[PDB]
Structure formats: structure tokens, C-alpha cells
Amino acid sequence: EVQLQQSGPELVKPGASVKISCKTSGYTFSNSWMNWVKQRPGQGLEWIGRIYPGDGDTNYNGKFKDKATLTTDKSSSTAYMRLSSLTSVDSAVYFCARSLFDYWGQGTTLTVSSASTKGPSVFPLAPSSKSSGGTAALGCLVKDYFPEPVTVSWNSGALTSGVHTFPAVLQSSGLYSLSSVVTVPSSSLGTQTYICNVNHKPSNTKVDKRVEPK
């Protein structure tokens, strides 16, 4: 299968440059165009430009010609996008996408800010009687982190039934929080394993928090 695997999230200061990568597999890298796309609230999906790895040909959106430089490495089947003179307007999720947008990477979140990273505090939402008939609830609170993103799974992704992960919300005083909950049969309380896996790559914070009745 075709795979486009992008590099991890980035926090960079205003005025800096950053280089994002898109490592491909499952097709001949040299023979398909690679596009880059920006997604930012209020701007929507914007095409930055494309590069043809076989000969280095490029086409840029005039809006990004002074901002972005596309290159490729045929040896590693990887496409790169360098963004320079960064400002807050450059904060966005960036995607690589092949050909006529037929396959997409998972995205890279870029935050342009003078702030430093701050990892989340991860707290259990402990089940009890007070968390309905034959259904109980449990969860994890992921509090006061910066920048986006954070990923949350349960039991390394093996648990998906009954899982609700709430959106990250930027709080008034500048940090993000979210939560993730699971509803389960009340019989499962204290008997089944529930581990919330939290990964905040910008701060290198990885937490695997076992959630048990209080």
C-alpha cells in the first residue's frame, strides 16, 4: 500500500525556519508529483506547491513562493518542505499529498510561538458508584499543556469500544487541556485493565496511566 509518513510536531520561534519531511513507501517515488497543503482555521485547505521527484520540477502557489522551498531525496524516497521567516500565521497542520491528492500523509502540526513546551498533567477520572444502572464511566484528564498536539489511546489502541476523546481546548490563560473517557459495563470496574496512553511529543512526555476505582 501507498504510505506517506510525516515528521513529528514542531514548536518554533518567530523568525525561525523549519523543515518538515514526508517519507514515502509502496510506490515509485520518482514518478509521482508530491504536493504540500496547509490547513489553518479561517484559511481552510491551501495548496502550497508541488515537486516532481524524478527531475526536481516545482510549481508553487504565489502566496507561498517566498515562504516555502520544496526538495526531495530520491535515496530515502522522502520529500521535504522548508518554511522560513516564520510568523504566527504559519501555525497550522501541514500535509503532504501525492498526485491529484490521492493519498495523504497524517499531517504535521506546527506552532510558531515564543513560548516553551509544557507537558501535560495526566489524572485519572476514577470510576465508582457515582460514575448509571449497568454502565460505568472512567477516563483520564490531560491538563495544561503546550503546544498541540497530544495523542490519547486506551490499552495501546486495543480498546476502542465506548471511548470518547474530547477535543483539545485552548484555555483563556494560554495552555491546552483535553480529556478522554470510556463507558464500560459496570461489572468491568476493578476487574478489567484500563490504561490511558498519553503522548505529548513536543515535551517528550509519555504517560501510561492505569485507571482504577478510587
Binding site: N61, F101, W104, S132, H164
Partner: protein, 219 residues
């Protein structure tokens, strides 16, 4: 730029019923090579866009037969014969005939379904968070519809004002419901000074408001 104008911007559909989204391009998308480089993409919340339709009417592999694409020139339509719960998301048209390639603003497809009351759950602050010097009391409203709900906090029977924040999930891709978290934020000292913590929920699907509560120290 070629401007891609989609209509409607929000589409509210009952499961099992047809839906359509149209796209107008400001220049013809017919290319000199005879092809019309119009595609449709779907993006689910927290995921990358996925292509569904290309060259106006061709279906990508794995895309259900209920999706069809049509049109020519500057006017195109994406049709869904019967909307399933998993069709929710934002649909974009996109053109690759003219540089710069451009995308529509997106049409959010949301599902209509019957009223469902929330199940309600309340969580004291964790000992770990208290040991860390802060306190969050959380009330969860799970699997309800419609999205609108009222959550009222009472501490020792005193109505709370301005010290809670609610967050709502995206619509569920299987049962089309929502879930909502309400966090009551107090200092640890304030938390330890009061006893009864209650969240009261009123929703169209509840005949009467539902209250969940706990007493600090009554484990």
C-alpha cells in the same frame, strides 16, 4: 485563483436518506488534455482528508457505491444515495486543472436522529491531582441527542456561576450522538472546605433534570 464555491455549507440529513453537495468553480475545469480535474475529499475530525471521487465521477478504491459524482464545466455535484452514520465529516471539492490548485471551504455533513437522553456520571478530583495542589470536578453526559444540554453545578447546595467549562465531542460515527464534559474548577482549599458536589443535567430527552452528586470524604 480559481474560487471553489460549495453549497450548502452545512447539510443535516437523517440516516438512510439522500444527500447532495454542489461545487461551482470560477473557471471551467476542463483541461486542454480532455480531462476535468475535479475531486471530492472527506475529512473526519482529527484525521487527514481522504479522496473519494476523482475526474468528476470516478470512485476511489474502497469508496461505497452510494457515492456518485457528476457535472462538467464549472458545476459539479457529489451525491450520496443513502447517508450512513459513518458518512459524517467535512466534504471538500478541489481542482487540479489550474495553478494554484484550490479547495472549496468544506461542507459539514451532520446526521439527524431521534432524541436520546444522556447518561450522567460525576468524578471527584483524583488524589493525584489533589496531591498536586489543584482540583477539577468532572461531570460527563454521555451519548445524547440533540447536542444542546444544560449542566448546573451546586456545591453544598449553592449554585455555582462562572467556574465551569464544557467541551463537546464530535458527533459519533456509529450512533450519531454526542458526549459532553463539564469541568468545575476550584482551588484545592475551596474543594476541601465543602462537602456536597452535584451536577444537575437538563436535556430535551429527560422528563425531569438528573442530578449526580458525591460527598467529599464519603467514599
Amino acid at each position: 485563483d480559481v474560487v471553489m464555491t460549495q453549497t450548502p455549507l452545512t447539510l443535516s440529513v437523517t440516516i438512510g436518506q439522500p444527500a447532495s453537495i454542489s461545487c461551482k468553480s470560477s473557471q471551467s475545469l476542463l483541461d486542454s488534455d480532455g480531462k476535468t480535474y475535479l475531486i471530492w475529499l472527506l475529512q473526519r475530525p482529527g484525521q487527514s482528508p481522504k479522496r473519494l471521487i476523482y475526474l468528476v465521477s470516478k470512485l476511489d478504491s474502497g469508496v461505497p457505491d452510494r457515492f456518485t459524482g457528476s457535472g462538467s464545466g464549472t458545476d459539479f455535484t457529489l451525491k450520496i444515495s443513502r447517508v450512513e452514520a459513518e458518512d459524517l465529516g467535512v466534504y471538500y471539492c478541489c481542482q487540479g486543472t489550474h495553478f494554484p490548485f484550490t479547495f472549496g471551504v468544506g461542507t459539514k455533513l451532520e446526521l439527524k436522529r431521534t432524541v436520546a437522553a444522556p447518561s450522567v456520571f460525576i468524578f471527584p478530583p483524583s488524589d493525584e491531582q489533589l496531591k498536586s495542589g489543584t482540583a477539577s470536578v468532572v461531570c460527563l453526559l454521555n451519548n445524547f441527542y440533540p447536542r444542546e444540554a444544560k449542566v448546573q453545578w451546586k456545591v453544598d447546595n449553592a449554585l455555582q456561576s462562572g467556574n465551569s467549562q464544557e467541551s463537546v465531542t464530535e458527533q459519533d460515527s456509529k450512533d450519531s450522538t454526542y458526549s459532553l464534559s463539564s469541568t468545575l474548577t476550584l482551588s484545592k482549599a475551596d474543594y476541601e472546605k465543602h462537602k456536597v458536589y452535584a451536577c444537575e443535567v437538563t436535556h430535551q430527552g429527560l422528563s425531569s433534570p438528573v442530578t449526580k452528586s458525591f460527598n467529599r470524604g464519603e467514599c
